[PDB]
Amino acid sequence: HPIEVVLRDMNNKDARQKIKDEVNTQKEGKFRLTIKRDIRNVLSLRVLVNGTFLKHPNGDKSLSTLHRLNAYDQNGGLVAKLVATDDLTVEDEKDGHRILNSLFERFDEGHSKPIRAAETAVGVLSQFGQEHRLSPE
């Protein structure tokens, strides 16, 4: 029944990267966040996403399956990863918004550092009400 598309910001190798050294974790419903403990001098953030999206007849897109969200610091270091344990529906939207909030607040509580995202990620961040945090310039 659904028209699905697979949208990627990353190749398979980058998408399967694991975080180095000690980490913190957070669960919000289906979402599971893993974040580097030592995150001092993370000066900017870049968010990439691979996922399967449900195409809506009018053209809109909704994330049905998060494959992987990666967040990189200015040096290309993987400082955060977000995955999910099951397919996503509209009921997971509050869980998604909340855990992405947690991701960005850890790196930018002062709301000053530049945060950018690739094409797929942008749409996902928009869906979970986080696009306002971006500095695409």
Experimental method: X-ray
Please tell me the distance from the alpha carbon of residue 7 to that of residue 116, in angstroms, as a whole number. Answer: 18
Question: In this structure, is the dihedral angle defined by the CA atoms of residues 15, 7, 104 and 99, taken in order, positive or negative?
Answer: negative
The whole domain housing 34 covers: 1-137
DSSP-assigned letters across all residues of 68-97: EEEEE-TTS-EEEEEEESS---GGGHHHHH
First to last CA, the chain: 38
User: How far, in Å, CA of 33 to CA of 76, rounded?
Assistant: 19
CA 68, distance to chain mean position in Å, is: 7
Instruction: Give me 71's structure tokens.
Output: 């967040």
**How many other CB atoms sit within 10 Å of the CB of residue 48?**
21
Please state, in angstroms and rounded to a whole number, the distance separating the CA atoms of residues 51 and 9: 9
Task: Name residues whose C-beta falls within 8 Å of residue 59's C-beta, 6 or more positions apart in sequence.
Answer: none
Resolution as reported, in Å? 2.0
DSSP structural state of residue 40: T
Element housing 122 (H / E): helix 119-127
Domain count, the chain: 1
